[PDB]
Amino acid sequence: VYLRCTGGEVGATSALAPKIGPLGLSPKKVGDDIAKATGDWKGLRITVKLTIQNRQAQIEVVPSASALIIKALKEPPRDRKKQKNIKHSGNITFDEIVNIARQMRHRSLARELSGTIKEILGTAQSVGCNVDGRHPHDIIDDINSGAVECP
């Protein structure tokens, strides 16, 4: 299992990860091309990739990182071609989507059962951080729901 946290386009501009790979010799271009097909349509932004090899294969699993999918919950798509107005627009509500996100957060948080993870993912963001009519500093002391319904 190989891990890599990079993504813009696919690349292949005479630059890649391989170092552990050429001891098993299965990718030199075919794995990078299959990574394109497994990273099609989701998305145009930085992801976390881990590849499983059994002597001839590349199994591309994308473990959804928390801040990466929070950035992916912006307005899509923005990769190039009239970027930079400027970097941090971020006008989103995320009423239940971050709730489904920490439902997907399995065995990576060392967590309490959705008690303070609302505070964690409310204050761990940088661009959005609330519905447009309140404050996340109030969310620190706001509604404590979900902690009964998740277990």
Binding site: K19, I20, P22, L23, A110, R111
Partner: protein
Amino acid sequence: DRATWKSNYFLKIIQLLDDYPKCFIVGADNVGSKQMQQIRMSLRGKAVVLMGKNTMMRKAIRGHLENNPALEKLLPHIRGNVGFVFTKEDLTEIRDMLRANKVPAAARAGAIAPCEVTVPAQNTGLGPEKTSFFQALGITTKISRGTIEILSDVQLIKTGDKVGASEATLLNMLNISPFSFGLVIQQVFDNGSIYNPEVLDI
């Protein structure tokens, strides 16, 4: 700070002493933060582990409240990195012997205990080169099909020897399991009882 915070810590310890009358004395001389996260998130459904300062010498003041039996026997037990484990469920002697789990191969320079480390002849799977550590210590190696084989079979670190930094890094790259050590239960306390664990408990 450290006045209202220490009073809140005293509220926490009087809450745990008034809630859970059954305790387990443990010691954690060789432990890590990720190890403690593993132990807490494995023991969420049961007993709560609480360490502390010399402020853990508080059962004297709890006796000065004049609400206790002869609980002051536990006062000289808090010597040399001693922590409490408060429980309510058991009433069952299977805890911490079915739950005493080993440490997943934590290496750090400075350990001598308890045993020796030997390196068998095996295809290590090391990429180019990872030979400077083997050249700094002295190990006869031969290169087969791309994985590197070790021709001899020698002992790197004996008992009582200080682990070096380069030795720790080469053990981490060879993935041979280093010294691993967890917490040690030392004394059991169940409702005013005095257990003598040589060998009585469990």
